[PDB]
UniProtKB/Swiss-Prot annotation, chain B:
The gene is MRPL44. Residues 14-84 form the DRBM domain. Keywords: Disease variant, Endonuclease, Hydrolase, Mitochondrion, Nuclease, Primary mitochondrial disease, Ribonucleoprotein, Ribosomal protein, RNA-binding, Transit peptide. This is Large ribosomal subunit protein mL44. Signal peptide: none annotated.
Curated annotation (Swiss-Prot), chain E:
GO terms for molecular function: RNA binding; structural constituent of ribosome. Component of the mitochondrial large ribosomal subunit (mt-LSU). Mature mammalian 55S mitochondrial ribosomes consist of a small (28S) and a large (39S) subunit. The 28S small subunit contains a 12S ribosomal RNA (12S mt-rRNA) and 30 different proteins. The 39S large subunit contains a 16S rRNA (16S mt-rRNA), a copy of mitochondrial valine transfer RNA (mt-tRNA(Val)), which plays an integral structural role, and 52 different proteins. The chain holds residues 35 to 142 of 142 of the full protein. It comes from Homo sapiens (Human). One of its GO terms (cellular component) is plasma membrane. The gene is MRPL42. It comes from the Eukaryota. Keywords: Mitochondrion, Ribonucleoprotein, Ribosomal protein, Transit peptide. The lineage of its organism: Eukaryota, Metazoa, Chordata, Craniata, Vertebrata. This is Large ribosomal subunit protein mL42. Its main location: mitochondrion. The keyword Mitochondrion applies. It is found in: Mitochondrion. GO terms for biological process: mitochondrial translation; translation. Belongs to the mitochondrion-specific ribosomal protein mL42 family.
Curated annotation (Swiss-Prot), chain H:
It comes from Homo sapiens. This is Large ribosomal subunit protein uL3m. It is linked to Combined oxidative phosphorylation deficiency 9: A mitochondrial disease characterized by failure to thrive, poor feeding, hypertrophic cardiomyopathy, hepatomegaly, and psychomotor retardation. Death in infancy has been observed in some cases. Component of the mitochondrial large ribosomal subunit (mt-LSU). Mature mammalian 55S mitochondrial ribosomes consist of a small (28S) and a large (39S) subunit. The 28S small subunit contains a 12S ribosomal RNA (12S mt-rRNA) and 30 different proteins. The 39S large subunit contains a 16S rRNA (16S mt-rRNA), a copy of mitochondrial valine transfer RNA (mt-tRNA(Val)), which plays an integral structural role, and 52 different proteins. Belongs to the universal ribosomal protein uL3 family. The gene is MRPL3. It is found in: Mitochondrion.
Curated annotation (Swiss-Prot), chain I:
One of its GO terms (biological process) is mitochondrial translation. The lineage of its organism: Eukaryota, Metazoa, Chordata, Craniata, Vertebrata. The modification N-acetylserine is found at S1. It holds the Pfam family Ribosomal_L13. This is Large ribosomal subunit protein uL13m. One of its GO terms (molecular function) is mRNA binding. InterPro entries: Ribosomal_uL13, Ribosomal_uL13_bac-type, Ribosomal_uL13_CS, Ribosomal_uL13_sf.
Length: 146, 94, 39, 99, 97, 38, 160, 87, 177
């Protein structure tokens, strides 16, 4: 990659990189996910792929550099946010309640003091409508709202 | 005689003594009592399955609320199996 | 399993026109067949 | 009046109790109740819920054998659905036809 | 190498089908508890060993809370019942097997 | 701030930011343009 | 060299349930023959005791054993103390083995013997209908006939 | 009377020991706990300082009584209502 | 079985002391399986008048996990019946106050609403941390499997599966990152 060092003398240097794994099963794909046959087959747990697609301090990388299509990029950014909130990325930190599948930022959301009637209930969101189209492997679909 | 149990009809006192006498006279090593299964133990309703073993081979098992009564019941089960009065024995032919 | 029974052709209720519901319940111990059942 | 309507409710409640006990035994063998019932009727054993609960309580080995037969029928069904061709139908997926 | 269920808790179950395919034969011998899986069995100079017979009389509240702690119930099981229920109770119930 | 349902940029210096679960129009040079989505 | 169809090991690239391979049919039929022959020689020698059966009788399924009692809710056109053979045997079983019919076992394979020992009536059952504010009130008493059968013996023959 | 005082571990004193008035010092601040003077069963006027009703101007047998205790929609009286009792 | 009648009855109707772990488990799944075990619905000899419940010992209830934003969304509501007794605390506040209240309330909700619920809740035992009293520890039988799978954060993947997972994209050589 490329790094800058400060000593006033600052310098940009080139370090080693990892390249593409040799033989993708679908060479005709247009995004890396499409090339590796992972379109609906990943979740927020897959921190190997997520850490492959993030910055070292937890931020996301741009679509153009990653080569991702827009839909896959938005699914990656939501999965990265949920994994960060669940605490599955302890080394990609900036600069106690256990959670998972946290859609919204925990410090931005107001409590449901008045749940509705059972025809207009105020439901509690779990997971992501971006990941709604994942493969189900069950006879009941994902319940996005609890 | 149909619906009754062997030690319901023939009362005995020391099933362990009868069992060790039977095993001695049919040339079997003396049985060892071991705690196969246990639930509770400190509460007022314990459950003990004690197994009687001979040459590291199970011959009987018995439940009880205490260890001693579980061992006695295991001795009675051993006597039943050795004598042919088991619950699943062949019924009488009429 | 009514749909599976319909696929196999064995009605939907197991109590319909099968051997289980149409064979005689009992017979005499010497072998004489029972009189036919009302149903 | 309560006696008569309770005849109706007694039949319903007894079937509910049988289903509860069969579900308990099936979960004790790692199986689910719909899988057990559907696979037994696919294997053409027409034991009802009353004698199934009776076997669950008093004959645990016979119930374990029934659960194993049902699970084996489930695996045959999954294998046939996965194969989707004209493979052999399976040993216990065979249907005894009557005429 | 295939078993429909694990074969180590109740019986070694083997399913079979007869040659005509008309009946299913099950063979299930019981499993026995291993010896190694078991556990070994648990184990004044001048006067009498006088028998230690103290029976402290607890009043109703402490007695019921002690019984509730012992048997993991509530207090309502231990509180008494009236003469109406006591005489309604059947003292010669039917008995099957 | 002014509570609005539709937020409209009134300057070239206004900007939409989503903070605490709500959209906001912040303007540094014209502070009367501060709008809060409701 | 990755196959055209390879997926990397993610959380849900593969099914949650473990892969199950079924045994080959030829070896399985030989194993079935061995197990059936083993159970048949147990039946021949007599290494069993206290058989039970699940018997279809009077639209119900009864789990009977020897020296048993059942109560049939209708008359059976038989004299008392009369020995009959129950035939629709859904299941027979012992300790260490059971036999399963599809759905009925062979009459050559298994016999159930029963004896009519009582022909009686039930206790009186009340049917009362009441609809309120409509003067609707109706009472009836029924006594269903009943037949008590004693299951004598359950016999199996070596025919597997 | 025995009273229980919460202390830290460095202030433990041996049981059976005498305590006197110079345990405190002048210019200090203390809290004093006691059972108050008991007035028996008292009405709302002495117990809760209710204003009560006028004496003359037509009033029938109401001068020291509580008025409404609740509203009509509530089919009950709220817990913690100020009503006569031991004061 | 050839047991005598009283030992056979005792063996059938005896109680079992099941063990269950919290530690990033969802309290609703914990409460579902604990409720089944407390009612005795896992037994084929079950009947509602047979008092066939079992003891359930749940530990590490301080380390439960809510899916989604339930820590801030979910509100527990109670009312001390004095005018103004209406209190509403979030799940976070209730967990910070009492480490066992959430799991206790979930199990109390899923138990049947009859007179047996309090007896079942007395047979329930909850502990916030790894510590269990010694008598309960000598009573315990069968730690039950956890419902969740503990999704295994990035730093405890070993190098074998890390380099077994293939690399999806090649980055430009001049990107700072
Ligand atoms: Mg129905
Ligand atoms: Mg005045
Ligand atoms: Mg007047
Ligand atoms: Mg006056
Ligand atoms: Zn794509
Ligand atoms: Zn502006």
């Amino acid at each position: 990659f490329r790094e800058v060092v400060e000593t006033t003398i600052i310098e940009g240097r080139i370090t080693a990189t990892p390249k593409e794994s040799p033989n993708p099963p679908n060479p005709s794909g247009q995004c890396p996910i499409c090339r590796w046959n992972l379109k609906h087959k990943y979740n927020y747990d897959d921190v190997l792929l997520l850490s492959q697609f993030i910055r070292p301090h937890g931020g996301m990388l741009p679509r153009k550099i990653t080569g991702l299509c827009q839909e896959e990029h938005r699914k990656i950014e939501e999965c990265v946010k949920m994994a960060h909130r669940a605490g599955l990325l302890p080394n990609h930190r900036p600069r106690q309640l256990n959670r998972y599948l946290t859609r919204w930022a925990p410090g931005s959301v107001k409590p449901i003091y008045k749940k509705g009637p059972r025809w207009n209930r105020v439901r509690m969101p779990v997971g992501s409508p971006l990941l709604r189209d994942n493969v189900c492997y069950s006879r009941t679909p994902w319940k996005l709202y609890h | 005689m149909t619906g009754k149990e062997l030690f319901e009809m023939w009362k005995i006192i020391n099933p362990m003594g009868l069992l060790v006498e039977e095993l001695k006279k049919r040339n079997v090593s003396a049985p060892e009592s071991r705690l196969t299964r246990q639930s509770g133990g400190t509460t007022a309703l314990p459950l003990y399955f004690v197994g009687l073993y001979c040459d590291k081979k199970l011959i009987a098992e018995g439940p009880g609320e205490t260890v001693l009564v579980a061992e006695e019941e295991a001795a009675r089960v051993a006597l039943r199996k050795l004598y042919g009065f088991t619950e699943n024995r062949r019924p009488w032919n009429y | 399993g009514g749909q599976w029974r319909l696929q196999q052709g064995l009605a939907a209720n197991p109590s319909g026109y099968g051997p289980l519901t149409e064979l005689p319940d009992w017979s005499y111990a010497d072998g004489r067949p029972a009189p036919p059942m009302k149903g | 009046v309560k006696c008569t309507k309770a005849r109706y409710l007694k039949k319903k409640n007894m079937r509910t109790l049988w289903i509860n006990r069969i579900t308990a035994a099936s979960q004790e063998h790692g199986l689910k109740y719909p899988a057990l019932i559907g696979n037994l009727v696919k294997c053409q054993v027409e034991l009802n819920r009353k004698v199934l609960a009776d076997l669950a309580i008093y004959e645990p080995k016979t119930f374990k054998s029934l659960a194993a037969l049902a699970s084996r029928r489930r695996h045959e069904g999954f294998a046939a659905a996965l194969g989707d061709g004209k493979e052999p139908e399976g040993i216990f997926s065979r249907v005894v036809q009557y005429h | 190498t295939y078993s429909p269920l694990p074969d180590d808790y109740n019986c070694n179950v083997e399913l079979a089908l007869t040659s005509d395919g008309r009946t299913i034969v099950c063979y299930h011998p019981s499993v026995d508890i291993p010896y190694e899986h078991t556990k070994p069995i648990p184990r004044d100079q001048v006067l009498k060993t006088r028998l230690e017979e103290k029976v402290e009389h607890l009043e109703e509240g402490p007695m019921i809370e002690q019984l509730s702690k012992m048997f993991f119930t509530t207090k309502h099981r231990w509180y008494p019942h009236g003469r109406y229920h006591r005489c309604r109770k059947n003292l010669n119930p039917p008995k099957d097997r | 701030f002014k509570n609005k349902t539709v937020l409209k940029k009134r300057c070239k210096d206004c900007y939409l930011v989503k903070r605490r679960g709500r959209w906001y129009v912040y303007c540094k040079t014209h502070p009367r343009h501060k709008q809060r989505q409701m | 060299s990755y196959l055209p169809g390879y997926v990397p090991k993610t959380s849900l690239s593969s099914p949650p349930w473990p892969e199950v391979v079924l045994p080959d049919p030829v070896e399985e039929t030989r194993h079935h023959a061995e197990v059936v022959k083993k159970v048949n020689e147990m039946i021949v020698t007599g290494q069993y005791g206290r058989l039970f059966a699940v018997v279809h009788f009077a639209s119900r399924q009864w789990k009977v054993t020897s020296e048993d009692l059942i109560l049939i809710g209708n008359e059976l056109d038989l004299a008392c103390g009369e020995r009959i053979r129950l035939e629709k045997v859904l299941l027979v079983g012992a300790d260490n083995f059971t036999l399963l019919g599809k759905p009925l076992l062979g009459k050559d394979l298994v016999r159930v013997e029963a004896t009519v020992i009582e022909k009686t009536e039930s206790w009186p059952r009340i049917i009362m209908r009441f609809r309120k504010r409509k003067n609707f009130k109706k009472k009836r008493i029924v006594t269903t006939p009943q037949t008590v059968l004693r299951i004598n013996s359950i016999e199996i023959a070596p025919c597997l | 009377t025995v009273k229980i005082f919460n202390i830290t571990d460095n202030a433990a004193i041996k049981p059976g020991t005498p305590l006197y008035a110079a345990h405190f010092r002048p210019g200090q601040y203390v809290d004093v706990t006691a059972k108050t003077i008991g007035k028996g069963f008292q009405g709302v006027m002495k117990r809760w300082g209710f204003k009560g009703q006028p004496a003359t101007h037509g009033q029938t047998k109401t001068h020291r009584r509580p008025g409404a205790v609740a509203t009509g929609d509530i089919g009950r009286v709220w817990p913690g209502t100020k009503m006569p009792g031991k004061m | 079985s050839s047991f005598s009648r009283a030992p056979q009855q005792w063996a059938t109707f005896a109680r079992i002391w099941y063990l269950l772990d919290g530690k990033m488990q969802p309290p609703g799944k914990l409460a579902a399986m604990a409720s089944i075990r407390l009612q005795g619905l896992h037994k084929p000899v079950y009947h509602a008048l047979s008092d066939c419940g079992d003891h359930v010992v749940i530990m590490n209830t301080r380390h439960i996990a809510f899916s989604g934003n339930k820590w801030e969304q979910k509100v527990y509501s109670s009312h001390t019946g004095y005018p103004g007794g209406f209190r509403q605390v979030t799940a976070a506040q209730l967990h910070l106050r009492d480490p066992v209240a959430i799991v206790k309330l979930a199990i109390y909700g899923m138990l049947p609403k009859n007179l047996h619920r309090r007896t079942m809740m007395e047979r329930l035992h909850l502990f916030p941390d790894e510590y269990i009293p010694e008598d309960i520890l000598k009573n315990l039988v069968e730690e039950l499997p956890q419902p969740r799978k503990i999704p295994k954060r990035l730093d405890e993947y070993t190098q074998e599966e890390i380099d077994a997972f293939p690399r999806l994209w090649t980055p430009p050589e001049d990107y700072r990152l």
